[PDB]
Symmetry: C3
Amino acid sequence: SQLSTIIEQAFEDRANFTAADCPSEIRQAVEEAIAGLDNGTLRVAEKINGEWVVHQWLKKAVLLSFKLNDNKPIESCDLRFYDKVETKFSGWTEEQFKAAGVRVVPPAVARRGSFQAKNVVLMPSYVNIGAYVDEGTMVDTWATVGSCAQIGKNVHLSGGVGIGGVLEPLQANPTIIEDNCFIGARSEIVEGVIVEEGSVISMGVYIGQSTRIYDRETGEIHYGRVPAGSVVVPGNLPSADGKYSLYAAIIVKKVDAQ
Amino acid sequence: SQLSTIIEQAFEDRANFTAADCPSEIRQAVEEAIAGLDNGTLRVAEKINGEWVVHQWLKKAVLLSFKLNDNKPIESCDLRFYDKVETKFSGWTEEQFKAAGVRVVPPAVARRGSFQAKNVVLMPSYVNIGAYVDEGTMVDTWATVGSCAQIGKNVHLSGGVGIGGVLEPLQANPTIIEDNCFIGARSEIVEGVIVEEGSVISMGVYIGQSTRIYDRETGEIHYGRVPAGSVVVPGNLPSADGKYSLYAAIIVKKVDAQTSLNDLLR
Amino acid sequence: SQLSTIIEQAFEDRANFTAADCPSEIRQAVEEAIAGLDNGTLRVAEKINGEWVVHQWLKKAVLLSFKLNDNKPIESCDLRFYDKVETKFSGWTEEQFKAAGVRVVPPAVARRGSFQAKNVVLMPSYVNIGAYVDEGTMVDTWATVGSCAQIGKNVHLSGGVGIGGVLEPLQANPTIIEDNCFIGARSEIVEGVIVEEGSVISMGVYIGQSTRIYDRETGEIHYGRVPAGSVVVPGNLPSADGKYSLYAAIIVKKVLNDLL
């Protein structure tokens, strides 16, 4: 609340600071908020009484962190980069890596301001700022955890899986993968879609806000949400004339914990 | 003009010099064309009076730069590489970065000989040699702009998007994404297909030269070109017997100046 | 020959030594097998008189190298990592690279314990431990060769192609791409499926073990194996009611742009 209030008020008067002219009270709080997102003590969105709630002042902190830091050079011995977001693990000691319990397989990179819990294995992949990856989740090769995405415990994002980042609109739920979910390879969950815990997404399943998700047992079509324990494979739905088919996600069976 | 003619005659005589016994006259000209591709003053393909034109002599210069350079080790502090194409930003000063207006988000890599304009953001991704990326375009995570590809102004290549490189057929227009285009995630536009300005490609759309492109209003089938302002989602077309359907790209709407991504795809 | 038996008995009694209290007989042998997989003299699977055989003790050696090594920091000048598997080309001299005939395009990475043969081109991509990539094969941008996967001679893995890794169950043939195959972009061949030589997979084809493979001329549905010289495109099969269609891989011909 005391830190939260300084962030929100700084965001209201944000057309008055640059990376050069900004009072150090505001830099300290934004730096304080990024640090909290980075070690998981803060999170962009959490589940309160079964509903995911977005904490906008942390999205505002992330935006302010862009406003107040210019691009600086980032140097590999022969490769160079240029960005305003530090990488998460730069300058980390060996004692720090051991303590976090996260395996960062080269060339994996996470942005500072994202959280990975103990026993997360980052294969070559990318985790963007504001994301939270919970204990025991495997991020496989060339997978992407987008900004502010919330990934549950013991989640498997198979290779080439993209979890779409949602930063703006400030009122928007980020993309959420709940506990014990398997996302098959080359799949893409974007635009704030929620996959409820225990689901099994086959390979090649693309789910956005416009993506129709057909329940082949009920015939009902819902959007933006994969119900818990769904087994979702890619398919198509025919048109009225049967001259073409449009893409759809098909729920083919349902399974509780046991 | 004098350089255009110089490259071509040496390309005809490429069977007479190698990376070692190349006259330093030949090495200086390729670097000038490579340098021009890298800062955007030359481009493998440009649009002239509404028609896209390929400058084959620039494809020939790129090929020659492969012949005249051997592989050299490339050193990150603990990871090693080995290639004959320099990366674009090695040795770049902070002043060079500032002036170019390009964000290179680590571990993004572009090869030297490609161009990115101001306000281009390269998320972790690869831009290959001979490609041109114009003002304000977002190249997202694990995207690929292949060799000689031309990406327009204010384009969004979503994550996992592949723009296939076209070098081999010298006479072919490379793959072109025209201005104000959205390419959704895990999509692939290859083999010189053209996407005309203002189009909106949903996730999971693969378009090559062989790919059927179905206009659901007209019944027309296009190849190699997405007409301007098309909204394309992936779909299927039934076979003659209806025992199966084969992959196809479906045009489901057409628009003028209407740009909502998520409601425009429903 | 004597080395294979040392690995297997260490694997059978692996609940009795750790990375700290490990007898040097067992650690010396696991390192010898990792060394051998890296230069191609050993392979997790090879083709013998037309039959592919898996050498399970090499899968067991790979596991032990995970067991016997802790995570260490891995540093680029400004980027840092933390892992127990070393990089393949780390510390390689310029003469070492020249000798191997592999181009490693930055930022491509292979893990130590994997093999790439002459005239293999690694675009930015990943090769996992235990995989074998044979002479003249092109691995394109953001492609993945999973662990123990065997890729044949003169194969093209297009951009974004994933070849699925198989480590456990030990008796499993890994994922195998046979000689002279073209895998189109955004494709995924996983779970030990074999693609027989001369096949052509279009863009956007996903093949796991559960994936239906429809031969549109015979009407027969095959699983887990692509017959040699097949041309495979992505498609759909209708359900009994025709209210929907589900994913399947369709064979449209058997034998470059004219094929698909």
